[PDB]
Amino acid sequence: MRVIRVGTRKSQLARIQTDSVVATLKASYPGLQFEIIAMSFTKELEHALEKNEVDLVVHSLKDLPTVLPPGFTIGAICKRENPHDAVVFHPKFVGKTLETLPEKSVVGTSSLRRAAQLQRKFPHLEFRSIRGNLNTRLRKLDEQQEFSAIILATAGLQRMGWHNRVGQILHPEECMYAVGQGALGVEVRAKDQDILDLVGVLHDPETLLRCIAERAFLRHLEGGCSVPVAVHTAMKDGQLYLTGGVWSLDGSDSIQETMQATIHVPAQHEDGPEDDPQLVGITARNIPRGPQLAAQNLGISLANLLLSKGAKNILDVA
Numbered sequence: 042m043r044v045i046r047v048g049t050r051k052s053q054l055a056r057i058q059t060d061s062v063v064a065t066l067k068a069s070y071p072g073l074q075f076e077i078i079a080m081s082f083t084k085e086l087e088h089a090l091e092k093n094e095v096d097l098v099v100h101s102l103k104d105l106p107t108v109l110p111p112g113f114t115i116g117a118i119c120k121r122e123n124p125h126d127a128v129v130f131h132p133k134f135v136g137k138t139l140e141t142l143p144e145k146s147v148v149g150t151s152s153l154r155r156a157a158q159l160q161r162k163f164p165h166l167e168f169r170s171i172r173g174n175l176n177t178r179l180r181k182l183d184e185q186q187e188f189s190a191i192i193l194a195t196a197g198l199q200r201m202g203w204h205n206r207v208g209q210i211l212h213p214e215e216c217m218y219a220v221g222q223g224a225l226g227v228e229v230r231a232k233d234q235d236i237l238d239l240v241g242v243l244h245d246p247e248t249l250l251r252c253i254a255e256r257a258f259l260r261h262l263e264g265g266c267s268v269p270v271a272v273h274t275a276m277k278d279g280q281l282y283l284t285g286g287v288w289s290l291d292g293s294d295s296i297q298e299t300m301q302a303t304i305h306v307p308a309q310h311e312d313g314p315e316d317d318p319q320l321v322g323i324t325a326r327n328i329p330r331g332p333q334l335a336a337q338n339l340g341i342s343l344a345n346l347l348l349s350k351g352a353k354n355i356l357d358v359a
């Protein structure tokens with residue numbers, strides 16, 4: 042291990058996320074060299090990995106499928122940033138909330154998850170698609186009179202240093218977040234033991250266990266980034282709490298349930314067996330396997346409860 046090559050997309054937010062992970066790595070490894078390789082969507086970065094052109098890539102965890110191709114794996118789940126959804130208001134509406142926008146105000150979001158939940162909670166608002174990156178959406182907000190607000194992840198605006206645009210942070214009772222939102226995943230070659238060990242230092246046990254549950258829930262519902270599925274996780278008092286929900290496209294039909302499981306957060310790293318398979322695409326051999334399997338099982342458990350109440354028919358057309 043000499044120069045650790047980090048591959049990144051050329052987009053602004055992808056670079057910020059990569060730099061943050063590289064800074065954390067450097068703090069654990071001041072004696073190693075890190076190179077950031079920017080290339081001109083996940084299959085192209087996975088190609089560089091497979092061609093040994095880079096050694097690791099940084100993703101928003103919610104953008105990664107629950108099944109990765111067999112030669113790759115998530116070698117690190119970083120300490121979660123703020124997972125909650127946020128509202129940016131049109132300039133004339135600074136200081137308002139969703140509750141106090143005038144009736145028929147148009148709210149911009151291209152997430153089925155966000156639109157379905159907010160339509161349910163706010164019947165008197167209109168939710169409409171809006172395309173573009175964060176800068177483009179904010180430009181269409183401020184330059185035009187079409188949108189009265191847009192919905193975005195709090196974590197994205199924070200990484201841009203634009204927290205001053207956040208006008209409202211949505212509570213779970215208004216809009217539960219996407220599976221993996223606010224956490225970064227580090228993708229690596231599944232068989233590159235040296236690099237898996239290196240990035241393992243980034244694993245945050247609490248976030249790892251929360252995200253295994255969230256992803257196992259999503260996987261067992263056969264969902265991905267695109268579906269109206271939402272979650273809320275918390276680790277308190279030796280319990281892992283997982284809330285999960287599914288919504289019809291307009292939010293009028295929904296199923297939402299909570300489960301918990303006794304799972305203590307590991308406080309120490311351990312030399313785990315190298316022959317255990319990944320869990321929902323994540324490899325964490327330096328973290329005890331017991332709690333990891335238990336988190337996966339909790340997410341499967343909740344998924345089966347939702348399916349028992351009809352979640353599959355909801356998702357099939359949504």
Ligand SMILES: *Cc1[nH]c(Cc2[nH]cc(CCC(=O)O)c2CC(=O)O)c(CCC(=O)O)c1CC(=O)O
Nearest residue numbers: 101103150151152154193194196197219222223266
């Ligand atoms: C699965 C999915 N991806 C995105 C776009 C995206 N990916 C990451 C972020 C920043 C927050 C994070 O790292 O977790 C974002 C942008 C954002 O959420 O603000 C979306 C949202 C698409 C959209 O039109 O806003 C989704 C679907 C979803 O979140 O429900």
